[PDB]
Structures are given as C-alpha cells and as structure tokens.
Amino acid sequence: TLNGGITDMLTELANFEKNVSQAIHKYNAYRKAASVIAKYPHKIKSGAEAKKLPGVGTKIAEKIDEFLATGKLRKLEKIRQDDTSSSINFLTRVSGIGPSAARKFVDEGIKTLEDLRKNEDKLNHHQRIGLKYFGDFEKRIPREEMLQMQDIVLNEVKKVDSEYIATVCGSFRRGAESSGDMDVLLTHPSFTSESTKQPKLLHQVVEQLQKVHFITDTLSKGETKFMGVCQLPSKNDEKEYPHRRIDIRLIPKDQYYCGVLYFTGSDIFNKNMRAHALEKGFTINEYTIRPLGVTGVAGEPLPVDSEKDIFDYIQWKYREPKDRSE
DNA sequence: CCGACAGCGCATCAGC
DNA sequence: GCTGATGCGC
DNA sequence: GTCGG
Ligand SMILES: Cc1cn([C@H]2C[C@H](O)[C@@H](COP(=O)(O)OP(=O)(O)[C@@H](Cl)P(=O)(O)O)O2)c(=O)[nH]c1=O
Ligand SMILES: [Cl-]
Ligand SMILES: [Mg+2]
Ligand code: NA
Ligand code: NA
Ligand code: NA
C-alpha cells in the first residue's frame, strides 16, 4: 500500500488504545484516520498534507511528521519497551482474550503463546478455540477461497430449504480481494418480524453445515447469531486449508435490508452512517430504521424495500458496497 | 471550549 | 438458579 | 483524538 508506513503507525497506536488504554474513542480516531490515508491515492509527504483529509487532526498530523522524519514515533517505542502493555497487546490477538482476560493472565505469569498452551484449563471455551486456531486466525482468506466457501454455504442452506436466502456480506460483499472472516446474512420467506410460529431456523442451518463438516467449532449460538469456525475440504494430498471464522445472522425478511446494510459494513461506515442518522432524527440498527422523538423515544419501524431506501431517509446519496470501505 | 462519539448478540461472572 | 454487570465480539 | 456546536 502507498502510505502503508503511516497507516501501520496509526493502526499500532489504535491497537494500543483499544487493547491497553481501553480508550475506544481514541481507538476509533486513529483507525478512521488510517482508513482515509490508506484510501488516499497520493503519497503523503507531511502532516499538513494529511491534515486536509477527514479524521486527521492536530495530533495525528504531528505524529505523521515525526514518523516521516524519523521512521518511528517515540510513543510507539516506549510502548514496545513496556513489558506489561506489550504482553497484553499480544494476548488480545487470541480470539476471546480481551484486555480484562489479558491483564489477568499477565498477573498469573501467563504472557506467551506457550504459556497459554500450558494453562489451557484457565481459558473459557471461546479462548480455547482462539488458541487452537491462533495461527489460522492470523491468516486472511483469499477471495477465491471465499467464493468456494460461499458455494458450500449457499447450496447447503438451500438443501435445508430451497426458499432460504443467504448473502455473504462483510468485506467480501464490498469487493475485497481477501477477508478476515465470513459473514453470512440468512433469511427465510416464512420468517417475518419475530412473529412466533417456530424459531429454531438458525440451528437447522448450523446443524446441516456441521453435518458436512464445514462448520467444525462453535463460539456462540442463539436464535439470531451463530459464531464459530469452518473449513474448506481439501483434495487428497493438498495441505489443509486454514480454519476460518464464521458469523451467521438470521434476520426476518422485512428487516433484510437493514440487516444486509449492517453486515456489509464497514464498521466505521456503520458508525458514520448511524451517527448521521442521529443527526437527521433517526436511529439505525441491524433490524430497522426508526424515527427519533424530540425526547429520545424511538418510533415504529419505517418501511424498506432496498438498501437505498435507508440512505434516502437520512438524505445520503446511495453508496455501493465497494465504496463503503471506510 | 467543550461534550458527542452506533448499536447490537451472546457468554460468563459476581453477588445474591 | 436468577439479576445485572462486565467482557468480547460483530 | 477529532469535530462540530
Ligand atoms: C466489528 C464491527 C462490525 N460491524 C459490522 C459491519 C461489518 O462489516 C460486519 C462484519 O464484521 P467484520 O469484523 O467481519 O468486518 P469486515 O467488514 O467483514 C472486515 Cl474487517 P473482514 O472481516 O473481512 O476482515 O459487521 C459493525 O457494525 N460494528 C462493528 O463494530
Ligand atoms: Cl477515548
Ligand atoms: Mg468480516
Ligand atoms: Na482535518
Ligand atoms: Na482477540
Ligand atoms: Na464477523
């Protein structure tokens, strides 16, 4: 990437804010500014040039000059010398270990990947799976593998019922050439706004995908969200594909477009879009867009026949998925 | 010179 | 066991 | 940490 030095610096600072400081707004400030710089098709030569882009303010501007002049930030190399913070930063890379579990492990002298393996009985189920697949979960999914995973998933849900609708969202739907995980929006013509005839629909889909040994592990399970692990089959004598993370969301169809807007992202896009909706008197979640009252109460769901309908309520021009990569 | 910063699903734990 | 918070994740 | 009021 063209400005990868700057975007790497900003990402590291962002990871520090989230993993150690727990300064979630600082986290989001660095990652927003990293996002715009990464999408900027021009080689940033100074913090002043950077300060013209949205998200880049005084302090990021200053840090870009320091990095462009020295190749590093003082703040970053003091963090890399802090052994508690660096241990914490590493442990939060394991799926299921956050700042709270990380600093509890550090205080027990659990500090390295091998330490975790030696004390696996101290991990909850999620953390075990993150540890088991730690290397795999550091690997990106080439788009060609996403296509083969989409192939299995979409056919399998048709097998459990031919009217099922499955849409692979996330970065894949935005056109990314590789993705971190797989995000599947699932909906069924029989399933409208939580009208209770018979739930259990997600379990049936999960069951079938376990049956064919595509889904290999379970991180979470409820009526609307399944999170877990999956794997492409190999031909005889190829290396196994890495295990991959998978999130499947079951949503009523009348909420399908709010659902696919949410699951397509990006997370920063959703934050920006939902904030702007607040600025126009609405609130957006993965299910509905509602009007906000003068006092904060939310209204009844508004009708939606397309993603574009939601952009229209808040007076945005429609952005195609490939330009939502904020 | 300040306060806002999206909104949710699920698993686990602390205290009862 | 339940509530309610905290934790981690999307 | 940024931005908007
Ligand atoms: C983390 C996050 C995700 N989402 C929505 C929006 C988001 O697009 C969707 C999937 O979450 P994802 O973590 O899989 O993000 P992704 O775009 O797929 C890429 Cl980062 P990759 O996974 O390909 O590496 O969930 C949010 O709305 N808020 C969030 O805080
Ligand atoms: Cl913050
Ligand atoms: Mg994803
Ligand atoms: Na600016
Ligand atoms: Na993690
Ligand atoms: Na995900």
Residue-by-residue DSSP string for A179-228: ESSEEEEEE-TT--TT--S---HHHHHHHHHHHTTSEEEEEEE-SSEEEE
- Name the burial class of residue A208, with classes exposed (0-12), middle (13-18) and buried (19+) by CB atoms within 10 angstroms of its CB: middle
In three-state secondary structure terms, A46 is coil
Residue numbers in A 106-135, CB below 7 Å of strand C: 126, 130
User: What's the CA–C1' distance between A135 and D4, in Å?
Assistant: 43
Specify the CATH number for the domain of residue A153. Answer: 3.30.460.10
Distance between CA A50 and CA A35 in Å, rounded? 12
Residues A135 and A49 occupy one common structural domain: no
Does residue A49 contact residue A33 with C-beta atoms inside 8 Å?
A: no
Does residue A263 contact residue A249 with C-beta atoms inside 8 Å?
A: yes
Residues A35 and A104 occupy one common structural domain: no
Residues A34 and A76 occupy one common structural domain: yes
User: What's the CA–C1' distance between A16 and D1, in Å?
Assistant: 13
Residues A256 and A292 occupy one common structural domain: no
- Residue A101: CB less than 7 A from any atom in strand C: yes
Residues A163 and A238 occupy one common structural domain: yes
**Cα A267 to averaged position of ligand 1 atoms, centre (Å):** 5
Across-strand partners of A69? none
Q: Is the CB of A254 under 6 A from ligand 1?
A: no
Distance between CA A98 and CA A110 in Å, rounded? 14
Q: Which of A215, A233, A262 is the last residue of a domain?
A: A262
Residue A183 backbone dihedrals phi, psi, to 5 degrees: -120, 115
Question: Is A63 a catalytic site residue?
Answer: yes
Q: Is the CB of A263 under 6 A from ligand 1?
A: yes
Which segments of A are annotated as binding site for dCTP?
Answer: 140, 171, 174, 180-181
In three-state secondary structure terms, A111 is coil
Q: Which of A55, A82, A109 is the last residue of a domain?
A: A82
Which segments of A are annotated as binding site for Mg(2+)?
Answer: 181, 183, 247
Q: Is the CB of A183 under 6 A from ligand 1?
A: yes
Distance between CA A232 and CA A12 in Å, rounded? 32
Pairing type for strands A178-179 and A282-284 reads: unpaired
Specify the CATH number for the domain of residue A12. Answer: 1.10.150.110
Nearest nt to A60, CA vs C1'? D1
**Cα A263 to averaged position of ligand 1 atoms, centre (Å):** 7
Q: Which nucleotides of D are covered by protein (CB under 7 A)?
A: 1-3, 5
Q: Which nucleotides of B are covered by protein (CB under 7 A)?
A: 4-13
Pairing type for strands A225-230 and A178-179 reads: unpaired
Residues A105 and A126 occupy one common structural domain: yes
Does residue A282 contact residue A292 with C-beta atoms inside 8 Å?
A: yes
User: What's the CA–C1' distance between A229 and B3, in Å?
Assistant: 41
Residues A161 and A241 occupy one common structural domain: yes
Specify the CATH number for the domain of residue A128. Answer: 1.10.150.20
**Cα A170 to averaged position of ligand 3 atoms, centre (Å):** 4
**Cα A103 to averaged position of ligand 2 atoms, centre (Å):** 19
Residues A157 and A112 occupy one common structural domain: no
Closest CA to A170 of A305, A325, A304: A325
Residue A57 backbone dihedrals phi, psi, to 5 degrees: -110, -160
Residues A118 and A132 occupy one common structural domain: yes
Structure tokens at A93: 């890379």
Structure tokens at A311: 């952009």
Handedness of CA A169, A171, A176, A182 (dihedral sign): negative
Task: Name the residue type at position A137.
Answer: F
Residues A123 and A54 occupy one common structural domain: no
For residue A254, the surrounding DSSP H or E stretch is none
Residues A147 and A50 occupy one common structural domain: no
Experimental method, per PDB record: X-ray
Pocket test for ligand 1, best of A15, A139, A182, A183 (most atoms within 8 A of CB): A183
How many structural domains are present in chain A?
4
Note the resolution in Å, 1 decimal. 2.1
Does residue A313 contact residue A289 with C-beta atoms inside 8 Å?
A: yes
Q: Which domain covers residue A116, as residue numbers?
A: 83-139
Residues A32 and A99 occupy one common structural domain: no
User: What's the CA–C1' distance between A24 and C7, in Å?
Assistant: 14
Angstrom distances, CA of residue A61 to CA of A27, A68, A105, A144, A285: 16, 11, 36, 38, 33
Closest ligand to residue A263's CA: 1
Give the position of tokens 């169809």. Answer: A253
